[PDB]
Write a protein that binds this ligand. Structure first.
Ligand code: HEM
Ligand code: HEM
Ligand code: HEM
Ligand code: HEM
Ligand SMILES: [Cl-]
Ligand SMILES: [Cl-]
Ligand SMILES: [Cl-]
Ligand SMILES: [Cl-]
Ligand SMILES: [Cl-]
Ligand SMILES: [Cl-]
Lengths: 308, 310, 308, 308, 308, 310
């Protein structure tokens, strides 16, 4: 997929832009927004074509509520606003957003330029409500210093995990994407030893190897995020984390973004993380990371997107 | 597709070579030509294997006349010579060519060496009548200074636009390619202002953003080259422009090359360009660009290519 | 084919590692081996995910004997051990191996690190019986100075040539691989003129252009390794040579690895080379190269491998 | 210069970090700050050594006031706080800063990591007061769309322009650096035609060619920033602009940074820009760009820096 | 040596452009030419600054006749026109040129664009009399298939060899350059065996290893081009060949460019090649290469050039 | 410095080759050896010219014994065999070698091919006694998992540290290089925790940050290898480590190579490491790393190198 919108399956990139917008309550607003995101390949190629590599991609997400404003029937099976979580200790807020632009390329400028054109076409019809500029941090690490995104599926595995789906054939090729902007408590995290940190995560730190079953804490992040159903089938999401931050504001962040053919999978992971399994046995990553956003979007296929 | 001939759908490259040749009249000539082209997979790997990235590609095109010498039996549905167009001030000549090699690579030497080995194999069985060494100019601009190749289809849209399907199943996976070598009038073009240039093209110059409907002249190159049928169904082609030129001769060029599943789409684009729509409302790019060549070729799929003549 | 085990079709690489191992007889060995190899994309992802480019790949092969010890249930049609060849002047030995790891990447460190993790995870359950650290030598040459790999099938051709096959539905997507470690007599080779070396190979040395029919000796490496059936159809294999060696030991090597959906094609090339066509008219490449190893492995699809 | 602090002469980079800090009024503050910036190569190599290319560099600037707190004699000839400007229409503010870290590398992460280590070593002894993450925008353009930094001197030209100087031999190898964070009025600027924009700048837009003398407006940026003395000697600075911004905050910026052996040159340019020459005939770039900062720092040589 | 005119010492490049021009006789011509060439780093920076890598370079040469028309004041010691050579079988013509632009970069577009700007700035004041678009051919080979440029001096050696010179203080830092455009007879060349071609050159073809003393013919290109003085000191030049050509015209070329602090060294190589050592024993490279041009230019230092 | 031999100051590379050889006893042997090494500029260009970046470099080192066979006249100030050290549990053997080739490039094949042509020229006039194919391991870490090479001097500091100056003007621009091939005990080392490993080294593991004075053991590798004279003047060396190993043999290595203007600086580092400071307070890296070789060589400047023997 070179220069196509809704390229959910792209590998990771040196640079990302996450733009989250709310739509004008007006009628003229709903119409410009629709006509801009439905002609999204225009600016995608307008920027992207200037780089020989063609690394630029753009996935458009539309939140449940705005989807209702532009389409009666049909609606995809699982589109709903992001479900908030109130855990023993930690909370995942559900925050506003009608549009997501998830932008990737090999260079920052390519990203920024696509974002500039998008934001400009929208004018006063929409309002930026969250904006992260992500960046690869050494060998795909997060600011907690672990290699992050490892066990992502790929090739056929990834298409079955992320993309609808004979099960909902009107929206075949689409996906459900959840975003969460996490901020970290660096100083707290740095008071753990490497080994404690590894126990919190589920893998070794430098060498990025999974801890043995007989050594792998039942509340480790890896454990809480493994999903096996009754039949013993595993269910995976496609994740695309990036680091971001501000030195002066002491803000160090991980931007979570996860794609799935069914958001039941992503939501189950989030429940096991915030509420624990067994209940109360929650993910220690949450002791060091706080989600400031939580938004759920439908990712239309190219065809479905182009028709709005 | 890596080191396979007839890879129509390859992304743009840093360097290209376009060779157009005319075949000899004899029966020797025609059979040498069929050997070289049906076994083009050989020189392609002989050269291209030597570069780890395997960027080298080579698409072979056969003209309508030569096709009749080789396979009178069985002609693809729309293969004919290039249709010359002739407007009041600007014309699109129909110039000779039996063979097209459209070569792309990340490096000049690979393009050159492949060309060299091909030309060497043909020997006196063919003559080069056009040769262009193309090169990427800045951020994929053409010598007029505009980003060029932008609205080209990609992925599935591209395959559908460019390759013969069910409509002509005997030649599924082939294409029709048209080439034209254009020369520009740089000082004429430089007397225009940016804003005027933008009105000629249909997009802003630096930022490559499409002009909105209301600012978009009916004879902008973009407007004229938009093909929408009565059904309201859009028809695209796959274009592959490269810059070329010579500073001493004051030649500044764009080499045009368009692939289509049906050349009717390309031919209509050319009519709207040269004859205008409504009539006489022609494409002002042509005020600054003169076509020195125009030739149509059939691009056989690999299976078909391997069978000539034989 | 990003970070998938059994990516047989991958292109040449700047670096590769070839590991051959024998398993222990203990049932516990039997089981360690099967754990590690069936979970192979754990380490493949543990390591490979640290490279932005994702160039790392790892193909696992399993020997006939070892397959039997683990799945007397079903066998792939052509899984037998490597057949030794004993020819008028030169011979191809049949040497041990239960496991092949064919590892490739853009960098040595990735190859070495994947190997480190595999070997170490197999612990005393297995023993490295041959180890070759291969490298790209100039413009895809081998140490005899010829561009080597030129006539490999690509894309569809390659899949047809290398992957099973309606002809064996239970092992669809797998392959058979034969390795042979060759050592060259450099000084002898250098007494030939370039033209002589060209006559041995079947192609020109610098330009890598195939010699025409009337100047192609009938025992050139190329003629011998052309396999055309009675209907005039050509049967190809997918090959992956790398250079290797040691300056002080005066070892200058070519590691041969050949993939095919039916190893009989490979095996036939080997016979025409070693014994000759017609018999006695053998590949003069063998006057300057000696096979120190010869082993055949079955390459399972991901599904079959994941379930061993 | 690989991995040396005070590498004023480095070429431009894909990524930059500009950090401006104020020092604690305390005594313990003055001491940690001194010992951190005087051991600045420690973290420079600590981060920089992890990249094969070694593209990371770090220039440290110390403002006049803090310089006084740590050194009586000696003081460089021209160190003083940045002079504010009140022009016919436009104003250059003079804003706080004791320390500048001007950081460059081929990757964002390298920059951010160096900044993280610096800010962390400083702890509560200093406070970030300005922070820009710059990025190359296409072919060295600024967000106004012009190629920017063209006429920079280089090689010997650049060392004579930027570096002291037999004229002040205690501080030979040092430099004076002025920074200004500009924000742009994109919408206003976009209402000019290309040709007007070119007249404002002094060069053509796409092709980056200098306008002819007989066509070059006397109030163009190029004109106002050409410095010839009585004898007709030209005086140049070394400039190292980067773009930065925020889509949601509609902030589009150019970060100015200019190095000179004598700040008289930079200040004269700034006077001709804000006040005009003839007076009132000012730089139209200022009609579209507003400076939010203005700070002047001394850039000690390596030797002078290491001794504090 | 970043974006400086008269960067004689730069390494090989992937692309280059060689422009030779004759000036008109009008005094206005005289002056246009001198404006453009003395301001040459204007365009060099206009173009070159757009590439992050800064690989673009441009060396200006000036012919003897044209120098006279512009500076009868002082002349560099060795500035005379190219001396034709007329030998037993082959001749080197002396062809016109007043200006040389030797342009190099990592990409053709940079070369072409610098050329476009120069030629266009010279307008009708000058005429391009020869134009070669040179390219790197595989591993630094020329179209005869040999690695070509191997024995170039580097670093200090190169400066000693190419740059004037206490021996001519007024033109310290300049050089003399000789260009010759060669066309090859490819078919004739291919009738030689590789060994014969090696005997012609003086080195092995694929491995680029120098033939040992007893197998080096006395008329090999290498022997002939070895210049050793009476004290046994070797005098070298700095060379910059590129391949060029046209497939349809069957033109396969090597563009020779040679730099030296004293052109007599270059000139002597030329004599030993064309006329032979001993006389008649001439460079058999000339049986397969014909010089279509031959011109000598003086290469001013930046200071001298900037003041013409 | 591009394609010049004896480029001591080159930056780290992706690949290296370290060859150590012993010369034959004859007079033929010694003169072949002097031909090959004094004209090493030839193979260096023969190989290295073929790569556009010109990353290839080759530094030649001559042992003290062989130096006496070639230039009894005139010996540089500090040239002697490697001084073996012998502590209670860990030793630094002094192992044979007359010749060192320290080869660096961006690619393995260039290193290999240069080695091949050198070894081929020497013929039976020399024997390889050690050979290591080094490789960059992740973000310049060594097999112990730590970033390694960090505090190496750069620029002028480097030149001053590594090259002979006024002190020995007959050999200005030369150096003294010491090599040791270390083998690691990976399972011993893996039983430690990160924090302990950090205490062994003197820096944090992932982030490569120096530990502060108060957390910094007196026998950390970093502490022991800091050389400060009574004047309070620091003395550094130029180090060039590469990883190497073989998975089947369970060999995991660090190849050490240090350059100094005076080998006294390197030798003292080794004493503090092996014999400890205060005495017995040795470098715990040595609990996990065993030296299999130790050899000292003089690195002649180019001018000096060109003159042997002759
Ligand atoms: C600050 C937020 C987060 C940090 C720092 C973090 C970090 C990690 C790390 C270090 C790993 C192990 C490497 C890998 O296999 O990718 C991991 C794995 C994983 N993470 Fe998280 N993560 C975060 C948020 C989440 C959230 C919110 C979800 C679910 C909605 C999640 C889903 C997963 C999954 C599914 C895996 C792979 C588990 C497996 O199959 O081994 N991540 N992440
Ligand atoms: C020392 C070991 C070997 C060396 C140096 C060697 C070298 C070559 C060279 C130089 C070519 C021509 C370029 C190309 O198409 O790759 C070639 C072709 C070939 N080689 Fe070999 N080879 C070796 C072993 C083998 C073995 C053992 C087999 C079969 C099991 C083999 C199968 C082939 C095939 C199938 C081709 C393509 C022939 C064609 O054009 O159809 N190679 N090899
Ligand atoms: C928003 C702020 C600014 C923008 C967008 C801007 C943009 C430009 C552009 C487009 C050029 C022509 C290309 C070049 O030669 O670099 C230029 C040149 C120049 N600029 Fe500015 N600039 C800005 C601020 C300044 C400031 C504050 C100074 C002085 C303190 C300055 C000093 C120069 C100098 C010395 C030149 C080269 C003049 C010559 O010799 O041709 N820049 N800048
Ligand atoms: C068609 C034109 C030419 C071709 C194909 C050619 C080819 C070669 C080749 C293959 C080498 C050996 C590798 C090397 O050191 O570069 C060489 C060396 C050399 N060439 Fe030529 N050359 C040509 C013209 C010339 C001319 C006209 C000169 C002198 C004006 C010349 C001067 C040299 C020098 C100085 C060397 C190095 C000799 C040495 O080892 O000392 N080249 N050239
Ligand atoms: Cl961005
Ligand atoms: Cl070409
Ligand atoms: Cl390896
Ligand atoms: Cl940053
Ligand atoms: Cl050019
Ligand atoms: Cl090696």
């Amino acid at each position: 997929a070179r220069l196509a919108p809704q390229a959910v399956l792209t590998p990771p990139s040196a640079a990302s832009l996450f733009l989250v917008l709310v739509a004008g309550d007006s009628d003229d607003d709903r119409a410009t927004v629709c006509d801009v995101i439905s002609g999204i390949d225009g600016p995608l190629k307008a920027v992207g074509f200037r780089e020989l590599a063609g690394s630029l991609s753009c996935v458009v997400g539309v939140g449940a509520q705005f989807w209702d404003r532009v389409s009666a029937s049909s609606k995809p099976a699982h589109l709903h606003p992001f479900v908030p979580l109130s855990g023993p200790v930690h909370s995942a807020p559900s925050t506003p957003g009608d549009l997501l632009f998830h932008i990737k390329a090999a260079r920052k400028d390519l990203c920024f330029e696509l974002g500039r054109q998008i934001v400009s076409a929208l004018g006063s019809a929409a309002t930026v409500v969250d904006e992260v500029h992500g960046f690869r941090y050494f060998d795909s690490r997060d600011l907690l210093g672990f290699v992050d995104g490892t066990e992502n599926p790929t090739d056929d595995d990834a298409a079955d995990s992320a993309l609808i789906g004979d099960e909902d054939p009107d929206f075949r090729g689409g996906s459900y994407v959840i975003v969460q902007k996490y901020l970290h408590d660096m100083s707290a995290w740095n008071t753990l030893s490497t080994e404690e940190q590894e126990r919190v995560i589920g893998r070794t730190k430098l060498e990025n190897v999974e801890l043995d079953d007989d050594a792998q804490p039942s509340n480790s992040h890896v454990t809480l995020n493994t999903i096996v159903d009754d039949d013993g089938v595993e269910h995976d999401i496609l994740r695309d984390h990036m680091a971001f931050g501000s030195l002066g504001e002491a803000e160090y962040g991980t931007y979570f973004i996860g794609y799935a053919k069914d958001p039941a999978v992503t939501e189950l992971m989030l429940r096991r993380m915030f509420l624990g399994e067994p209940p109360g046995n929650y993910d220690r990553v949450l002791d060091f990371s706080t989600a400031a956003t939580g938004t759920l979007f439908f990712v239309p296929s190219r065809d479905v997107l182009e028709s709005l």
